[PDB]
Scaffold this active site. Structure first.
Site: not given
Ligand SMILES: Nc1nc2c(ncn2[C@@H]2O[C@H](COP(=O)(O)OP(=O)(O)OP(=O)(O)O)[C@@H](O)[C@H]2O)c(=O)[nH]1
Ligand SMILES: [Mg+2]
Ligand SMILES: Nc1nc2c(ncn2[C@@H]2O[C@H](COP(=O)(O)OP(=O)(O)O)[C@@H](O)[C@H]2O)c(=O)[nH]1
Lengths: 62, 62, 426, 184, 427, 626, 85
Positions: E10, E218, E244
């Site tokens: 995500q 983002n 580099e």
């Molecule tokens: N910088 C940033 N981090 C994000 C964002 N959305 C989720 N995260 C981070 O992603 C981490 C958890 O993973 P997720 O992206 O929510 O979901 P996933 O990696 O696909 O893992 P699953 O939910 O099990 O499928 C969280 O601790 C957030 O810090 C975002 O829009 N921007």
């Molecule tokens: Mg996820």
């Protein structure tokens, strides 16, 4: 192929009358009278298809 | 055939002129089924495909 | 893509499920006849989860009604949103168990479980990718507890790789309806701890207390109780049915909330909950929703969360917000109430955000907390069970239907050791 | 369709366990019926096609008659049940000379006729459930000097119980087959 | 010169859903995919009047993927690029690496293969993911290993988002982070750490926005990526490609964890407030209140540092600024690197994205450094890992999925050895 | 001081249940507006006198059978009692005002002998009160049920009443003069727990027909209040039944939740040779209607057919003819209006008979001379803000609450372009330059942006963020160099186009709402929430004079005649002011706009003045020399 | 990866190949509407439906909600040093 043929009678009848909501056919109760007494037997035959269509005057003429 | 993906070819993408990473060894490859394909593919001029065709022809001939 | 199969058992289960389906239909904007009539397009993209498509632009619920009395079915078909149910899912008995776990799990089960299993399995292949099962019922009745437990056993025997939610309402001594409540509840929870993947514990006393204090309502009817439970039921699953800035799977919640295989008894809450006389004097902001959510008087169980420790907790939000304010508010609630959380599990708070608030509200939230306060309620039931059992009162109607004493002894031992692990980890 | 797909070692065109199994297929039924029911042998949902006239009721693979799917997989595998009635199925293939050969396997014919466009073959099935693997490449090699390239459509006829018709690239054994493609 | 970007999870998908509109805005590409040579690094022009990105977004849930499919940029991404599974990893590294990975990674890599063959001067890889989740950790590591065994020699810029020390939105994220890092060591060559609380603080103080969502985070991550790729994209007084970093920022084969920062983060009114020159932005690029990972560099010593510049920048002022910084004593370097600075300049100034709060500044600087603050970060994560592992919590999910406590033991000892190496090298 | 003649009026409230009703005699229709009731001549669209006096929005209407007396009820703020107002339709004056219900009055009903009124009020009040018409007194009252009650109706002999609760019950209340009390008897439903919306009584008091939200008609035999056969046999209607009317014959005309009309036969009949009666068959399946039905009234009695006037939630009044001989409903819509609050309107340059008025999710192009709406553009779910024609007739720009600027075409309503994200939130003001190549925008963030539109693209130039509050208006000078932005910081900023900088900043204590250039660009006229109009020098910036007109409440509407002699102004009150420019003089008009006026303008040909308020009403006035 | 997804990608590929459409849904027609306006301008006896036409576009995808409040009252909250965000 059912283990008990009568294994669905009551549930099917109740579902048809109430659950599905369609009108149940309520006929052939004439002459049965009340309970606790013998029913008057009609001389009609169940199996016979006594249709005997009578188109006395609605028959088109060749 | 390459669009179908039945050719076991990848581009090494090396610093020098790029070589062909062959998924299967070229020695036991069926030349009867593959040589006419690449020889026909020599004709085309598009960037990603002509290099593959020429390099494959060169490798089989070598 | 992810599919939940709903099952309703017992009187309480059937009524709560009817209210839940009314709420879901309202949220997705489908009329009580089954035709979509909403405006936004977010509703269409996630109606496969609770509605198989049917010919004529009609959507039918993916739920199985199970009972033994014609009265419950008559009431369900009577009420609004009663015409949407598929008439062939009414797996149905004729006599009624009558508050007898033996009648629900050994006598009538032996001839109703086959049919209900066939319908459930067929509905399971009716959907492409299964996610889980959710059953709504009681733990004190006969047709809801025993038959529900047997259906759970058969299901979890057939499908060992799917999620399991059991929205079970539990008795309280203050609000006591029937007399064999401990006898039914002890065996039901005995099987649920070894069988169910998670259990949603509910009770009438907490809902009545909430309706008296927070909502300040005069007559807290069963309709109101079921509506609160239904709001919870929709909030727990809103994440799969709507997109959000942080999407949370049901298995994701299970993994985040279950540190040990048998510590899977959770307690539920909902917010906002205010009286109409005070709705106008309040704002709508994350700090106040969070303080209400973490307030002990917003909880739907007769167990004080301050009498134990929060092993894990999770909050699912709905509405347009900022993750910054959300996670700083969770930071504050974890830091100020630091002693109330467990020390060997850091970051005891899971948070999720969804972009669709429910109809009629600007913003909503749903709390789910795996704390250790449930041991108080379990001990409350267990002491009643031991008091009844030492005299063998009421035991003959259970022993005369195929049962004996060993299952009661094993259930008492299991509950004792289970509350022992709650206390040990507390 | 399917021309941009991955086309790995396995590829399914119809699976009896799903919300809408028949989305790309075009049912065409006259004097017959189609159902999705639970079989009493494997305890799962399978599709039944039944008809008085085997030449009338069938299901074709691509819904648009003009638009034809693209699958390069050599082997086609069906998992069917013998109902002790007439049953047939047809496949279109393309050769390197860019002409369309047709292979029709039928239960109700004796000789093996070879024509420029159609090759009609007999099939003999066991009692219950069975999986038939067609080997399009070898059949094209035997029926014509050509070799196999592409499959353009498939169409199964009446009197059959069907589940998990799919494509493959190898003569997979039962033990090495993935679980969802097995019989039990 | 072309580099391919892949997004997993995500977080990575949304970071990409930021970077790509930033890129098309820079190159003047309308969302439908056509203009009214510099684009060649990212967008390939196919057919006539159509530009397609060089990226794959892949994830197991379909929610974010089809939200992108139905979003604003429907016509831009090719429908075959967006891969979607069926069910989440549910914050389970084992589930993301062994259950659904075995089914999805083959298609993913045989799609990136066609991407690579269409590419001709492929510079390298860059991955976008957060190790806190399940998919972006498990199947991210699996795809990383398979890409390494496929190519190996090529650089792999991994812009990985690690959990904040004290801000948390998960439970088993220490497990996920350590398990992912165990593979991130020996496969990636250049891994860039990103945090969330540090960016929250940055937008709270400098960008003076009271309620920041993931969109701004983002957006600024996309700005950093664009600032570090502008050297390939455009021409400047002193350009550097992706290779580099591979030779100037990795002194040892295993010590590769680079901290990033960006300047100047300025709102609209502060643009008229403050005077944009080179010396003050170079100074601002070094205090702890302007770096993307919440840690204090004063506890550590710098090993290498790289400064990309965009805009009206002449080498005189950057040379003077670096001289002043080297003479400064508040930041200390290490004995094994007397020349620890690598500068680079590009003529094109940063762009402005309508919808953000960043103002049009004539120049900007991006900083990428190597230190030991990563060493304290990993120690903190290791401590909060062993605290939970002491009681065998949440291990039953992994053992049920198919893994054991073995790889836990090797990950723990490998991180211990990593800390040993940091404390030895910093001496 | 002299009143201004009021020309035509467009608008009515369709959300009010059973609001639109016809007079039993002659030609007269009446419907509720924002907070006033409006009479109209049924023959010709000549607006009749309005009846003010309501503190806030009117929510229910009732008419005596003789048609002499009318009753209206309103919705007020929480904690303040709502009042029922009685009017005489021969002598139009307040006769009785009675304030008893706590929050709102749900419904009112007049008696057959026009002696008693029934008032049901409150989502929380739920008390039925019986008033007498002779004097403004209350006979007796009683709480209805635990659940709220929706509708009240009398019989045709009127000692009795029937009400149906919203949720789950139904009661019949009889009134006796011995105890001066109301005796209720609850309905005997077998098992049904339906949610009732509307009820109608027969012409001879044998049955009553109530529409449930399940979508079916429900028949109750009176004098015992027993359930009988349900509604349509051909399934239920698409949503809950919302309107019901009684044909003079033995039929009921039912309007469902989705613009669906049906004629249902009332006589019972046994089918399948059983004691069970079949469901009420629809003797006519009426065609669909765009709006959700909320009001049905029997207008005319004709031996050839029956005419009904139907209101809709989309505020579209329909005339429908029903022929019992040949079963077919014929529909013609007669008037359309805005369902929601409207904000902002535009005039084409030197062109008169076109209005561009937009409400929530809707753009509408209206024709001045005949008031007939010419075009409509609908976006599914969005809030509209400032819209403006380009100086060329090519494009119509519109802001949207999601932060997007969209340009549409005059004919066929084709969208030519849209800006994906102009502002972080809702944009509030848009103006077009004379060259039709540049556009100025201003949102609630407080920043002003400028966009250059080329034949294939839309580019953003430098954006200025001087304001700290919502930008309320933007006005560009004849040459594109000068533009003024008025916001809610108490400051108006003058900008420069050639270099994107600011010249001066006019300051005031309160929030600026509107700013208008004087013709020949001599001065500026501004109006805000200080209740004060101020003249400003356009060049250096200086307060020339301040007029205290309409000190009672805020003023946000300003327009100036083309020559510059007359200045029309709105306000938070319900009156429209017409000042002279050089002197402070009044020629205003008072009785109009039951809701606060939000925008105003004068036609380029100096003939008409158009005003639009916070209710869905467009009031065409007549211009006159100040 | 799956069959339903593959069909969806094919359909969306076709939809991207087709040129963008300005109008999601139309009522009546521009030509008939022009004749209706023409007869209205020429004289009388024109029904309301003849002149009235509507066009529906894609519009917002999300449901309609009241706008967010990003900043509260300036006197309540401040940053570390001071100001009004
Ligand atoms: N910088 C940033 N981090 C994000 C964002 N959305 C989720 N995260 C981070 O992603 C981490 C958890 O993973 P997720 O992206 O929510 O979901 P996933 O990696 O696909 O893992 P699953 O939910 O099990 O499928 C969280 O601790 C957030 O810090 C975002 O829009 N921007
Ligand atoms: Mg996820
Ligand atoms: N919330 C709620 N609880 C109910 C309802 N009906 C019954 N209950 C509870 O259910 C308990 C009795 O369960 P019972 O009906 O005997 O279960 P069954 O015999 O299996 O159907 C009582 O303690 C009630 O508090 C209802 O409509 N709503």
């Amino acid at each position: 192929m059912n283990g008990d043929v009568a294994g669905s009678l009551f549930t099917s009848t109740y579902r048809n009358v109430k659950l599905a909501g369609k009108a149940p056919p309520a006929a052939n109760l004439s002459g049965t009278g009340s309970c606790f007494d013998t029913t008057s037997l009609s001389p009609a035959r169940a199996g016979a298809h006594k249709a005997l269509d009578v188109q006395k005057d609605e028959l088109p003429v060749w | 055939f390459y669009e179908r993906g039945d050719l076991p070819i990848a581009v090494d993408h090396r610093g020098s002129k790029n070589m062909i990473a062959w998924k299967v060894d070229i020695e036991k490859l069926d030349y009867h089924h593959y040589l006419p394909i690449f020889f026909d593919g020599i004709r085309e001029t598009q960037e990603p495909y002509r290099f593959l065709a020429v390099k494959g022809v060169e490798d089989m001939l070598r | 893509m992810r599919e939940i199969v709903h099952i309703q058992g017992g009187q309480c289960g059937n009524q709560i499920g009817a209210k839940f389906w009314e709420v879901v239909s309202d949220e997705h904007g489908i009329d009580p006849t089954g035709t979509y009539h909403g405006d936004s397009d977010l509703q269409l993209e996630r109606i496969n989860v609770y509605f198989n498509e049917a010919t004529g632009g009609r959507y039918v619920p993916r739920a199985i009604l199970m009972d033994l009395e014609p009265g419950t079915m008559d009431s369900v078909r009577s009420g609004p949103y009663g015409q949407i149910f598929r008439p062939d899912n009414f797996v149905f008995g004729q006599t009624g168990a009558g508050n007898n776990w033996a009648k629900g799990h050994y006598t009538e089960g032996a001839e109703l479980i086959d049919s209900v299993l066939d319908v459930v399995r067929k509905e399971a292949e009716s959907c492409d990718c299964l996610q889980g099962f959710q059953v709504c019922h009681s733990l004190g009745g006969g047709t809801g507890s025993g038959m529900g437990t047997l259906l759970i056993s058969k299901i979890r025997e057939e499908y060992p790789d799917r999620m399991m939610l059991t929205f079970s309402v539990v008795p309280s001594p203050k609000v006591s309806d029937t007399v064999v409540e401990p006898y039914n509840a002890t065996l039901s929870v005995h099987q649920l701890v070894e069988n169910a993947d998670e259990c949603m514990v509910l009770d009438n006393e907490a809902l009545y207390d909430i309706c008296f204090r927070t909502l300040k309502l005069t007559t807290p009817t069963f309709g109101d109780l079921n509506h609160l439970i239904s709001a919870v039921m929709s909030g727990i699953t809103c994440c799969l049915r709507f997109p959000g800035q942080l999407n949370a799977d049901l298995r994701k919640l299970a993994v985040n909330l279950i540190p040990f295989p048998r510590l899977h008894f959770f307690m539920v809450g909902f917010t906002p909950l205010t009286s109409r006389g005070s709705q106008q004097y309040r704002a709508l902001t994350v700090p106040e929703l969070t303080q209400q959510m973490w307030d002990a008087k917003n909880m739907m169980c007769a167990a004080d969360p301050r009498h134990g420790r929060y092993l894990t907790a999770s909050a699912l939000f709905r509405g347009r917000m900022s993750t910054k304010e959300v996670d700083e508010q969770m930071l504050n609630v974890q830091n100020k109430n630091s002693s109330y959380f467990v020390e060997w599990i850091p970051n005891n708070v899971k948070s999720s955000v969804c972009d669709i608030p429910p109809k009629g509200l600007k913003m909503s939230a749903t709390f789910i907390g795996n704390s250790t306060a449930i041991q108080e309620m379990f001990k409350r039931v267990s002491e009643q069970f031991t008091a009844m059992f030492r005299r063998k009162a009421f035991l003959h109607w259970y022993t005369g239907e195929g049962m004996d004493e060993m299952e009661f002894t094993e259930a008492e031992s299991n509950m004792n050791d289970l509350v022992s692990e709650y206390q040990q980890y507390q | 369709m399917f021309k941009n797909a991955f086309q790995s070692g396995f590829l399914s065109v119809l699976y009896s366990i799903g919300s809408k199994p028949l989305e790309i297929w075009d049912k065409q039924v006259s004097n017959g019926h189609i159902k999705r029911i639970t079989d009493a042998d494997i305890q799962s949902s399978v599709l039944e096609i039944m008809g008085q006239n085997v030449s009338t009721t069938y299901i074709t693979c691509p819904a648009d008659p003009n638009k034809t799917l693209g699958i390069k997989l050599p082997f086609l595998v069906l998992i069917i049940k013998n109902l002790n009635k007439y049953f047939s199925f047809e496949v279109q293939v393309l050769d390197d000379k860019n002409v369309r050969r047709r292979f029709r396997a039928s239960n109700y014919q004796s000789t093996t006729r070879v024509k420029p466009f159609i090759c009609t073959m007999p099939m003999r099935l066991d009692s219950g459930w069975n999986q038939i693997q067609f080997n399009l490449s070898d059949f094209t090699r035997r029926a014509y000097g050509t070799n196999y390239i592409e499959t353009l459509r498939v169409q199964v006829h009446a009197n059959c119980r069907i589940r998990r018709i799919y494509f493959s690239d190898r003569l997979y054994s039962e033990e090495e087959l993935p679980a969802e493609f097995k019989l039990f | 010169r072309e580099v391919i970007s892949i997004h997993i999870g995500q977080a990575g998908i949304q970071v990409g859903n930021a970077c790509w509109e930033l890129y098309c805005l820079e190159h003047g590409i309308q969302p439908d995919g056509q203009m009214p040579d510099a684009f060649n690094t990212f967008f390939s022009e196919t057919g006539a009047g159509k530009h397609v990105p060089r990226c794959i977004f892949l994830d197991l849930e379909p929610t974010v993927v089809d939200e992108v499919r139905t979003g604003t940029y429907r016509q831009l991404f090719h429908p075959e690029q967006l891969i979607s599974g069926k069910e989440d990893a549910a914050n389970n590294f084992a589930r993301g690496h062994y259950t659904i990975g075995k089914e999805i990674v083959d298609l993913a890599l045989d799609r990136i293969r066609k991407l690579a063959d269409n590419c001709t001067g492929l510079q390298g890889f860059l991955v976008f993911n957060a190790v806190g989740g399940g998919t972006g950790s498990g199947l991210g590591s699996l795809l990383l290993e398979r890409l390494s065994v496929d190519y190996g020699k090529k650089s792999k810029l991994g812009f990985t988002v690690y959990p904040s020390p004290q801000v948390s939105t998960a439970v088993v994220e220490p497990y996920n982070s350590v398990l992912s890092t165990h593979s991130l060591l020996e496969h990636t060559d250049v891994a860039v750490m990103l945090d969330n609380e540090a960016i929250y603080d940055i937008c709270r103080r400098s960008l003076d926005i009271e309620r920041p969502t993931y969109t701004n985070l983002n957006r600024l991550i996309a700005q950093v990526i664009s600032s570090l790729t502008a050297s390939l994209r455009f021409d400047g007084a002193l350009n550097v490609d992706i290779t580099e970093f591979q030779t100037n920022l990795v002194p040892y084969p295993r010590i590769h964890f680079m901290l990033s920062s960006y300047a100047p983060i300025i709102s609209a009114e502060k643009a008229y407030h403050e005077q944009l020159s080179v010396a003050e932005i170079t100074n601002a690029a070094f205090e702890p209140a302007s770096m993307m990972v919440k840690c204090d560099p004063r506890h550590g010593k710098y090993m290498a540092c790289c400064l990309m510049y965009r805009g009206d920048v002449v080498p005189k002022d950057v040379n003077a600024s670096v001289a002043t910084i080297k003479t400064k004593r508040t930041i200390q370097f290490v004995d094994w690197c007397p020349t620890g600075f690598k500068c680079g300049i590009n003529y094109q100034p940063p762009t402005v994205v309508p919808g953000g709060d960043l103002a049009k500044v004539q120049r900007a600087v991006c900083m990428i450094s190597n230190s030991t603050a990563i060493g304290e970060i990993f120690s903190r994560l290791d401590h909060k890992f062993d605290l939970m592992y002491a009681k065998r919590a949440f291990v039953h999910w992994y053992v049920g999925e198919g893994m054991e406590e073995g790889e836990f033991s090797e990950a723990r000892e490998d991180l211990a050895a990593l800390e040993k190496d940091f404390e030895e090298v910093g001496a | 001081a002299e009143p201004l003649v009021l020309n035509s009026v467009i608008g009515f409230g369709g959300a009010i249940e059973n609001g639109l009703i016809a007079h039993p005699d002659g030609r007269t229709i009446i419907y509720p507006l924002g907070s006033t009731i409006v009479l109209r001549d049924r023959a010709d669209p000549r607006s009749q006198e309005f009846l003010q006096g309501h503190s806030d929005k009117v929510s229910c209407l009732a008419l005596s059978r003789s048609g002499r007396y009318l009753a209206s009820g309103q919705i007020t703020y929480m904690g303040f009692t709502a009042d029922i107002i009685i009017w005489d339709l021969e002598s139009k004056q307040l006769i009785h005002r009675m304030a008893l219900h706590k929050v709102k009055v749900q419904a009112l009903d007049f008696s057959c002998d026009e002696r008693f009124l029934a008032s049901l009020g409150g989502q929380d009040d739920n008390a039925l009160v019986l008033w007498d018409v002779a004097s403004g007194n209350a006979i007796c009252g009683s709480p209805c049920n635990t659940n709220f009650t929706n509708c009240v109706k009398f019989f045709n002999n009127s000692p009795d009443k029937l009400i149906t609760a919203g949720n789950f019950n139904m009661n019949v209340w009889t009134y006796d003069a011995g105890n001066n009390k109301l005796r209720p008897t609850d309905a005997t439903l077998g098992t049904l727990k339906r949610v009732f919306k509307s009820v109608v009584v027969d012409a001879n008091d044998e049955y009553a027909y109530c529409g449930t939200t399940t979508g079916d008609v429900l028949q109750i035999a009176l004098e015992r209040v027993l359930f009988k056969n349900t509604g349509p046999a051909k399934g239920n209607v698409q949503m809950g039944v919302t309107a019901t009317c009684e044909v003079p014959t033995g039929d009921i005309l039912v309007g469902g939740g989705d613009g669906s009309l049906q004629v249902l036969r009332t006589v019972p009949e046994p089918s399948s040779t059983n004691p069970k009666l079949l469901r009420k068959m629809p003797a006519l399946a009426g065609t669909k209607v765009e709006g959700a039905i909320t009001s049905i009234a029997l207008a005319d009695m004709n031996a050839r057919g029956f005419t009904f006037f139907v209101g809709t939630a989309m505020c579209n009044i329909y005339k429908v003819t029903y022929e019992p001989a040949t079963s077919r409903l014929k529909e013609e819509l007669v008037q359309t209006a805005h369902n929601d609050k409207i904000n902002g309107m535009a005039f084409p340059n030197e062109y008169s008979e076109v209005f561009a008025t937009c409400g929530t999710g809707f753009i509408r192009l209206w024709h001045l001379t005949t008031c007939r709406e010419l075009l409509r553009i609908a976006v599914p779910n969005l809030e509209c803000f400032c819209i403006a024609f380009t100086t060329d007739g090519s494009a119509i720009l519109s802001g949207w609450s999601d932060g997007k600027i969209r340009a549409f075409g005059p004919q066929s309503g084709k969208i030519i372009f849209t800006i994906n994200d102009a502002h972080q939130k809702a944009v509030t003001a848009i103006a077009s330059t004379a060259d039709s190549s540049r556009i100025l925008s201003g949102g609630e963030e407080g920043m002003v942006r400028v966009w250059r539109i080329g034949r294939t693209s839309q580019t953003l130039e430098a954006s200025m963020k001087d304001h700290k509050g919502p930008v309320n208006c933007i006005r560009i000078k004849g040459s594109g160099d000068e533009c003024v932005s008025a916001s809610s910081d108490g400051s108006c900023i003058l900008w420069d186009l050639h270099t994107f900088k600011r010249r001066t900043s006019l300051f005031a204590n309160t929030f600026f709402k509107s700013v208008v250039y004087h013709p020949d660009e001599s001065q500026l006229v501004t109006a805000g929430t200080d209740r004060k109009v101020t003249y400003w020098d356009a060049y250096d910036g200086n307060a020339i004079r301040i007029i205290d007109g309409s000190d009672l409440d805020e003023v946000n509407a300003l327009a100036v005649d083309r020559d510059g002699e007359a200045l029309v102004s709105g306000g938070g009150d319900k009156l429209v002011k017409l000042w002279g420019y050089d002197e402070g003089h009044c020629y205003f008009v008072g009785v109009a706009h039951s809701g606060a006026i939000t925008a105003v303008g004068v036609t380029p040909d100096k003939q008409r003045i158009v005003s639009v308020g916070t209710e869905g009403g467009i009031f065409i006035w007549d211009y006159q020399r100040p | 990866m799956d069959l339903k997804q593959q069909v969806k990608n094919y359909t969306m590929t076709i939809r991207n190949t087709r040129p963008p459409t300005m109008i999601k849904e139309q009522d009546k027609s521009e030509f008939s509407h022009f004749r209706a306006l023409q007869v209205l301008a020429n004289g009388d006896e024109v029904p309301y439906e003849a002149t009235l036409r509507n066009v529906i576009h894609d519009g917002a995808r999300q449901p309609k909600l009241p706008p967010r409040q990003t900043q509260k009252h300036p006197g309540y909250i401040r940053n570390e040093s001071g100001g009004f965000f």
